[PDB]
Design a protein around this ligand. Structure first.
Ligand SMILES: [Br-]
Ligand SMILES: [Br-]
Ligand SMILES: [Br-]
Ligand SMILES: [Br-]
Length: 283
């Protein structure tokens, strides 16, 4: 879509609400990648079957995050994690959009953080939400833990009303790096947040914290698509706003859809990005 100058964004969004035009727009987002030769052979390989948290959520072959290969006794692939490189506001591969690790993929996850020089994780889920398992705890409750060759140590935790920051060290014990996790803890278990400011605030604090990071920021929720996508669009659009005073949700989203399936999974989430940014702009 066109870049909308911030001055006209509130009206653009009010007009979408009044015309009920979000449904049609989100419907073009959903079909925007069917003609591009995208494949997901790795995600569907029998060796990887237990590494996927959800059978309908795959990591496209061209943009999937590859792990280095190991030759193990079982002879099975080891280059695979359900995650994808995703572009940001004029920064190719600014994010890794990942599913929440399982117990069986926590070592893979840490190995991805090591091999891809990740220093920030953004987590937008609780572990269990109203009886639904969303994500396994992949970090030590207290002190230290080993996940294969990866030693994670929790140096400190700051708890705030809407998110928590955990400060870890990561070591590859086959040979320290700081990794900071921003964990948003108040996303409702259904729907989208009723109030956008806490989410805005989280996004801004995270963005400060990653502002000099040389490698990608890992973003996950449970499937790594809906809430993950919503964060990615918010973060990138706050950058667009600051640097060009414009917003382009529709075009940006269509582009990242080529990198990972279902990023911004629901129309509600699409709408919530727009409402959150109107609010941001109006103060
Ligand atoms: Br890519
Ligand atoms: Br799990
Ligand atoms: Br290793
Ligand atoms: Br989720």
């Amino acid at each position: 879509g066109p870049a909308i100058p911030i001055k006209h964004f509130p009206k653009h969004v009010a007009d979408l609400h009044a015309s009920s035009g979000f449904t049609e727009e989100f419907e073009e987002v959903q079909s925007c990648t069917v003609d591009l030769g995208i494949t997901a052979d790795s995600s569907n390989h029998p060796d990887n079957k237990h590494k996927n948290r959800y059978i309908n959520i795959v990591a496209y072959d061209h943009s999937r995050v590859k792990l280095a290969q190991l030759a193990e006794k079982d002879g099975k692939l080891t280059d695979y994690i359900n995650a994808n490189y995703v572009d940001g506001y004029n920064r190719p591969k600014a994010y890794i959009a990942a599913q929440g690790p399982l117990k069986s993929t926590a070592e893979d996850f840490w190995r991805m953080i090591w091999e891809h020089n990740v220093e920030v994780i953004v987590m937008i889920t609780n572990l269990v939400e109203k009886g639904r398992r969303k994500c396994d705890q992949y970090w030590p409750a207290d002190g230290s833990e080993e996940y294969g060759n990866f030693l994670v140590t929790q140096k400190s935790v700051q708890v705030l009303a809407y998110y928590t920051v955990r400060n870890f060290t990561l070591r590859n014990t086959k040979i320290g790096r700081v990794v900071t996790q921003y964990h948003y803890t108040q996303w409702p278990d259904m729907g989208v947040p009723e109030y956008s400011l806490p989410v805005l605030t989280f996004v801004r604090k995270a963005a400060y914290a990653k502002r000099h990071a040389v490698g990608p920021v890992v973003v996950h929720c449970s499937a790594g698509v809906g809430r993950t996508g919503t964060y990615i669009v918010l973060d990138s659009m706050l950058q667009q706003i600051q640097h060009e005073g414009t917003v382009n949700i529709f075009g940006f989203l269509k582009h990242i859809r080529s990198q990972r399936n279902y990023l911004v999974q629901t129309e509600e989430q699409y709408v919530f990005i727009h409402d959150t940014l109107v609010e941001a702009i109006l103060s």
